[PDB]
Amino acid sequence: NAAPQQINDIVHRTITPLIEQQKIPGMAVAVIYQGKPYYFTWGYADIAKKQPVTQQTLFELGSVSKTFTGVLGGDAIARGEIKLSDPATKYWPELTAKQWNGITLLHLATYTAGGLPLQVPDEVKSSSDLLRFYQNWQPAWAPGTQRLYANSSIGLFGALAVKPSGLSFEQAMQTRVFQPLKLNHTWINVPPAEEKNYAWGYREGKAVHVSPGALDAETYGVKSTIEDMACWVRSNMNPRDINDKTLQQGIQLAQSRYWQTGDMYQGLGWEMLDWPVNPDIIVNGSDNKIALAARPVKAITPPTPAVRASWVHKTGATGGFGSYVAFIPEKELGIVMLANKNYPNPARVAAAWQILNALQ
């Protein structure tokens, strides 16, 4: 049972050198210890205005957004609106090209459709551009054989998963995930009153915010504070405490184990490994040479129900920001690291693991 001053000492010994080594302008950390949050802030949200990071600073989550997409998809499954086995064509009948014949919502959600590319092309501006992109796409692999991390995959999952609801992705996310969890400072579109809290991102001496792009909301477009992200981790560790039954079930489905690649299991947005974990696997595995590579998968049948003895995690970047979330449900132990520089994933994962290792 570590005192607050011990949590303080572990965090300052790990994060202080990380910020110095990586030249991170501003950072917020939440440590969840025995289910309670402890917050830490460093540096500036806006360097030019000398505005410090606080607990109400909004950061770009980048691909940590995909964890919200996966849970929203889980909630739609629990409502009986979709099944992951459903063909994508059920929800987008204009996808008539033959290569779409056996591609399912599961394949899109879990990057296993057969080599959908990392990014939607920058030239895709309209609905009709997006249809033409998917209609002309040629798979490198048969469905359900290879995992290739891709915004064009889970982005389309998020867009199709909400069609039965009749809601936009943004409305579905606000009404079915943000509002029931009281994430009142979490946004896809930052409102005018909240702009004063929106940190700048920093890339090679430029102050930047993420640009609009196709399927951005579903893949890299969420902004949140360290407090709402600590709540997000607590909610994903303890779904049985959530009153909204389909959202409790959706959280559980997003940590179900659908595919295995090496020592990792693919959930909906979340990625999972057995705890205790070999930190070399998660640190080296976060390097883009492994994280962006195609890797063979085996289906898990039935999908394993969410394992509480897991390292559950997700990295995320935008041009100006770098985020990481990891937690271990069985231990009620977790961490959120939000920074306004996109610094290398291995440094994030190593620091997170050193802190949670120290507190086990």
**C-alpha separations of 175 from 40, 172, 213, 221, 232 in Å:** 30, 5, 23, 17, 15
Burial class (CB in 10 A: 0-12, 13-18, 19+), 341: buried
The H or E element containing residue 128 is helix 127-136
d(CA 250, CA 262): 25
Angstrom distances, CA of residue 80 to CA of 235, 248, 250, 278? 22, 14, 11, 38
Q: CB atoms < 10 A from the CB of 285, how many?
A: 22
Please state, as a whole number, how many other Cβ atoms lie within 10 Å of the Cβ of residue 200: 21
63 CB neighbour count, 10 Å cutoff: 20
The structure's method of determination equals X-ray
Residue numbers annotated as active site:
63
* Tokens representing residue 147 in the block: 């995992």
Nominal resolution (angstroms) = 1.6
Position 16, amino acid: T
Q: Residue 144: how many CB atoms within 10 A of its CB?
A: 20
**How far is it, in rounded angstroms, from Cα 60 to Cα 31?**
19
CA–CA separation, 49 vs 72, rounded Å?
37
Give me the domains of the chain, ranges plus CATH numbers. Answer: 1-360 (3.40.710.10)
Give one word for 114, left, alpha or beta, with left for phi > 0 and alpha for psi -120 to 50.
left
